Amino acid sequence: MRKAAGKYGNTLEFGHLVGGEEVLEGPLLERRNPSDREDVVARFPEADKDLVRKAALKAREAFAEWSRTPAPIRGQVLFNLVKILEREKPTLTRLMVREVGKTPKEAAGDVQEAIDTALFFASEGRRLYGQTVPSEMRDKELFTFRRPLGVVGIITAGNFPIAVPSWKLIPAVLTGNTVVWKPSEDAPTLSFVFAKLFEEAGLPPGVLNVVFGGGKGSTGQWMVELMDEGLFQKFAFTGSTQVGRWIGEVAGRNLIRPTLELGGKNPLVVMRDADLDLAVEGAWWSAFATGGQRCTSAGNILVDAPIYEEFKRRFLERVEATLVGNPLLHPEVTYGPFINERFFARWQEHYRVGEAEGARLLFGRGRITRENPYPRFLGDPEAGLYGWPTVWEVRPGTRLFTEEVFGPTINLVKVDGIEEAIAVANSTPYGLSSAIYTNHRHWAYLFKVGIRAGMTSINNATVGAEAHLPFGGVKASGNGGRESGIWVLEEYTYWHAVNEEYSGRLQLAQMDTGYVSPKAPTPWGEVLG
Amino acid sequence: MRKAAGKYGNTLEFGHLVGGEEVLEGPLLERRNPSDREDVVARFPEADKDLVRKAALKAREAFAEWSRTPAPIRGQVLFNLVKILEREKPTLTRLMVREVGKTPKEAAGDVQEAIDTALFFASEGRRLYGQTVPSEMRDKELFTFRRPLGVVGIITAGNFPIAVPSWKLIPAVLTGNTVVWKPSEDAPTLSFVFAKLFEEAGLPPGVLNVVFGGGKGSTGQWMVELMDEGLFQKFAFTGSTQVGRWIGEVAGRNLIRPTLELGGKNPLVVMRDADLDLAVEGAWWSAFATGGQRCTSAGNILVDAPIYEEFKRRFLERVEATLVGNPLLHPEVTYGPFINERFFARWQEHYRVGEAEGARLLFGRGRITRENPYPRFLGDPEAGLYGWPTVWEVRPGTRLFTEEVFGPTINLVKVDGIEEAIAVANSTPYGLSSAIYTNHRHWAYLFKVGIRAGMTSINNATVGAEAHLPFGGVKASGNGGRESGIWVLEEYTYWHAVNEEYSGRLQLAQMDTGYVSPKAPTPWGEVLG
Amino acid sequence: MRKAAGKYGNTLEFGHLVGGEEVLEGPLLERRNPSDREDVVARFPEADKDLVRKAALKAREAFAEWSRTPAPIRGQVLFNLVKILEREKPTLTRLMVREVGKTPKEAAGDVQEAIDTALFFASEGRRLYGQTVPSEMRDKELFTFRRPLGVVGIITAGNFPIAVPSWKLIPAVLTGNTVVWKPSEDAPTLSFVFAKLFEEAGLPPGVLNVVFGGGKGSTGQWMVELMDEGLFQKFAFTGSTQVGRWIGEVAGRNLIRPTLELGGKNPLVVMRDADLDLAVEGAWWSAFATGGQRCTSAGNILVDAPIYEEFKRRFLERVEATLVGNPLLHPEVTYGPFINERFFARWQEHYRVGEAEGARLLFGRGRITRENPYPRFLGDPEAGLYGWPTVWEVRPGTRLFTEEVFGPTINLVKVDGIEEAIAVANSTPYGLSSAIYTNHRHWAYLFKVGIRAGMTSINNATVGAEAHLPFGGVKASGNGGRESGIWVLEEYTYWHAVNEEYSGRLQLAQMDTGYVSPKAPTPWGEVLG
Ligand SMILES: CCCCCCCCO[C@@H]1O[C@H](CO)[C@@H](O)[C@H](O)[C@H]1O
């Protein structure tokens, strides 16, 4: 790599990581600081299909030795990574604030998720339990083993540039797979550095390959297409449902079960008996954490009729207090810029769609500019794409209600009773996260069994999942796979059933099984009388 | 249903089972006894897309009440089925001999697999374990629950008309799902009866719907296409890889992980130190059980060079002793007719492909006729499609070596040493079953870790998997899913992670976590010696 | 603590660790370097019953806050310990060579076991899985949780002064318990330092209390007796079966299940087909690792008749090559001194018992002195208690065959065939470790299912268990408990079953359960053929 002086740090120039070598091949892209476009964070090439193919073949070559490396040793590599991530947490935090516009508080939590993941799977090296199973035949033993799949293709987004990649990278290599990783073009430096920390931790060259570039019409797409050439035995993707469906399609015909985290429209229910201040804080954080650029961000606040006016009043008050700005210059802000222009553009459009379909705009004036200033802004709004906190009143069945919109926007929806709250909460193509604020035992229970969601919070935000629960969605949010904890092992391994015969005879199961039949029954009705 | 007298039993006329009602709608198909075309087993309608859609909506309606039925009660229904299958085993055995041409011995084992499955999952009703998980926050609890998916679409083959459907039907309903089942047109009576046994066991109407018909251009295809209309939350299919890839494709874009069992080309290795008589018997049974119409049937016998001539001699001797015939009239036969004409046709062609590519035909003269008689045939060969036991000598890389061929055919392949045996055993697009005969600890181990297969037998056949191990293949044989035992629960449920807050505060994971930092270290090198 | 200059390092003076405070109360004991009596390693007090009682009450006080500390945070403390043990491994290694007379190679492996344990349970903080279980009633949920027991009393030996204590200390505190630890008077410095490393890692004061002293008539005994006062909710002990039975007795009447590792007489079988050089090396290492002062040390080498003379010849040759000496001055030695005089005394007596009962002494002349020199000795044999490598030929049923003897001694026993090998291998009151050397699949299997032992090695030593398998013995070697891995969690937690009702009615299990009865059966025998 090379470095040059920049505004808020060095501008990094680096290439793809392929077979341990740095490959500077392809038209140069750059990543500008989203808080300040004058600050250039990285310059990096776009990998073409031929280079991704080459990376996949380097991964296949490295897979042989790596899969044969004892899992406890592979786990000790991850343990090295835990120490290295701990050491580098402040540096990675600072780089993440700069590269994707996260607050230092959130950026540290993002790095911490990777540390948590690393520690969890470091120890998993001495687990990866299969089963010993009793044969129905004598002189025979049955076994199950978890085996690695091969080469994993990974495409990740930039909103969680260390945490979410770690959910895939760490289990993948722990279970004995090799990886080709196409990180978001919004967080290439973090991705490059993270790959180098793996190298420092002792991960053999070629086990992790990083190929930079865009998505559609670019490296991301090339990578999906190479599933047709048999170069990936597994695929993982975070992004939109639209793209996920196509990846599911390609994976499906290549007999791959992809890991798909495909976003959501996450209902947060506030029942009449709720702790209003707690529910307001939870709804606020659910909506505006990461500037609403999380898959788990609250989409709709479903508020029970009797507290609707009081909640709206308190919620808008809380929303109005939100600090927005350059988090590098003003750490205390709740959120900073949009991660990229694509998200900003879609978010600008949702104002027009909302007005067109009769949503009531309670708060928000679109992009924050010097001409259109936001009272609690800190820094220069012209330096990047920053969005007004935005609050709507919407009806079910509308586009603002059903469609995911990354960015600082949230809808209030009036409901009456737990039955309607559940029905309305499920009136969305998605089913990722969910939440209900209530002190009512029974309502909490009804919501928990009534919601169709991968994750449910009782008196907690739709965001901030703990790193050691299964993470994933139902309906349009996923395809059944789960990340994190013990539940992700199904994603990166396959079951190998072994039966060992010692009888020296061909014994047929279900046919030669030595089942004992019952004896003649005693007439106990008559004996006991 | 209606019945009329037939040659070897009553001819059954029945319709689709939809919402509890019998629906006799659609152009009539018939199933003739494959051992004797004069014996008509069943007449049944072909369901059009509209009726399958209606069946899927009946399943969705029944799902609400059935998923809310406590799992231990759903398990007690399966326990009722265990008793009913036990009672009906002789009747089902006889019907299976008649309808699909299995031997009574194999037909009983087929019914027994369903009984084993039924008993396993009857008890699973009081298991279905999720987890309690410790929160990193105080006054907070984490939980995981297994939830049913919804409506399961099931398409099954006729080669295992009770066993293999039970692998899907039983776990599906146990886990709280409803089912639309499109059984093979080769085993419609068995399927109808099996569905009625579920009804007798107390399965509520609409939880299992059966729609009869063909595959391509027919009910099977309509059923796959309805995944695009959101009518299936899960899909299971047994059949060819070609069809499986298409089903995987459709499932994939609808964010479904299908259960796909897609056949194999199963290597059986005989090492130089093997028990020859045992390996011969295992190779023979692996090749000719069910007339080689199993997904797990041996495709290639890989024989170690030093025992090659001796094994070939003993194997051909064993093959020559094989009895073939109408298993209804001659129970003692090893195998009877082809299940259908599709399998017979492909099997006839493999002679021409083998000769064309220079395979050496050691034994077999194609279809058994009066003109082309087989010495050990019993009954009338003109009454159905019966195949000569067929043995080839082939080279790796040839079509006979790589391509699956249902029917009584097997290849011998010369290998030298465990390294070559493993490499050649993996030189196939498939990876379902596998086997090695050896007394050498180390060779068994190398094969076990070297093979790419879902299942491996040490000194046992490639066939005859025990019903309580995970069943499934890698590569072209499957997509990662497993059937049977605890491993199939992932197929018919999704994980629901619930976090419950009691702290009355918004606590952020990874950010507010109360991690304890270390104290000042003592310089022990200096303090001690 | 205080330090003074000594021969091979500083002499440490320290007191008991009770509630965070160092308590220098009680008659002073000392630990002399077992390799060199002139080198005084430590001076430390003997805790009386009143101080142990006080330590137990400090543990009870600390238990409240520590058990309420989230398990993931408790795990992060262990993760701190992993880093600290890594840092201190060279220092701990050196101290262990000095204090208990282990070779540097073995001492490092001992420290590494603790690091392995620490890492395993660091990650267990985010596991400790209980279950969610489906109720047979509607509107009801079932849960299981692992809860800590309370205060754990731990008594450990000095032969594995870091490894074996870590097996108890680490899981105990991870699962939320507090500990009173009575370490061996043979390794008080290591124990003091290990406790201080826990303190450095952030373990709250009082969660680990260390009380030094002897066993019988001393601190060890006082500690067992306090189970009668309800001060321990759990107890763990490593030592002799005799003492273990008494501890089991006291624990039993106080409704405690103690963790008891009680030594063994570990059979190593060498079958006629074995790799002789490998079996010789394994038998040699099994016998003389730690100078035969392991619970898992080989007691009897059972050699198959046809290879008996050849094995004896090669084994005695290998034994004769054994280097013995001061491992601080000569790291390359296989073993050094006896850990204590108790073990030396019993080992001296076994010569007299062996001769008395007609055992044939093949090799060994008792204590190594200048008068009685050993050819391959390095250093001064007068400086400590060093034992000749000792090899016997014995018959089954004799005291040398059945009774555990710590120290460098081993018996050869002639057997003929796997049946006799198994019977003779089981002809001992113990059942800890076991091993068989064979290339015969079937013999390995028969031994594996025929042996009565907690642990069995196939073509591996009776020693050197991997730290992530369950460790423990049957018969006189233990009481059912297992240490290490997931299996030790049962030792330090109890199951809490919770049922939550939401139905608003009293529903009786087994009585009000809504079991569905079967429908009227169809006579299928008659309906079909
Ligand atoms: C990693 C995916 C989650 C694993 C689910 C819990 C696994 C627990 O394994 C359990 O073992 C029990 C012991 O008899 C069996 O009875 C249960 O069927 C089985 O679920």
Residue numbers in the entry:
A (entry chain B), B (entry chain A), C (entry chain A): 1 to 529
Q: What did the article's authors report about this structure?
A:
Found in both prokaryotes and eukaryotes, aldehyde dehydrogenases (ALDH) (EC 1.2.1.3) constitute a large family of NAD(P)-dependent enzymes with molecular weights of 50–60 kDa. ALDHTt contains an unusually extended C-terminal arm forming novel interactions with the N-terminus in the quaternary structure which interacts closely with the substrate entry tunnel. The ALDHTt monomer is composed of the three domains common to all ALDHs: (i) The NAD(P)+ binding domain (1–125 + 148–261) comprising a Rossman fold, (ii) the catalytic domain (267–458) and (iii) the oligomerization domain (126–147 + 494–501). However, the presence in ALDHTt of an unusual extended arm that wrap the facing monomer through H-bonds and salt bridges shows for the first time how the tetramer is not merely a dimer-of-dimers carrying out their functions independent of each other, but that the interaction of the N- and C-termini in CS-related monomers may regulate active site access in NCS-related molecules.
Initially, when we solved the structure of the native ALDHTt, we noticed the presence of an extended C-terminal tail. However, in the native structure, Glu261 has the “In” conformation, associated with proton abstraction from the thiol prior to substrate binding. As previously observed in the human ALDH2 and Ct-FDH structures, Glu261 is suitably oriented and within a short distance to Cys295 to act as a general base for its activation. In addition, the catalytic Cys295 side chain of the native structure is observed in two different conformations, the “attacking” conformation and the “resting” conformation where the side chain is rotated away from the Glu261. In the native crystal structure two partially occupied and mutually exclusive n-octyl-β-glucoside (BOG) molecules originating from the detergent used for caa3-oxidase purification; are found deep within the centre of the tetramer. They lie in a highly positive pore created by the oligomerisation domain and inter-domain linkers of each monomer. There is hydrogen bonding between the head group of the BOG and the positively charged sidechain of Arg127 on the junction between the oligomerisation domain and cofactor binding domain which is positioned directly beside Arg126 which we believe to play a crucial role in tail orientation and thus active site access. Another intriguing observation with ALDHTt is the presence of BOG molecules at the dimer-dimer interface. These BOG molecules have been modelled at partial occupancy which suggests that the detergent molecules sample several conformations in the tetramer’s pore. The negative head group of the detergent molecule is attracted to this charged pore and then becomes trapped in the central cavity. It is tempting to postulate that this highly charged pore is not coincidental and that this is a possible allosteric regulation site for ALDHTt which allows access to the substrate tunnel of each monomer.
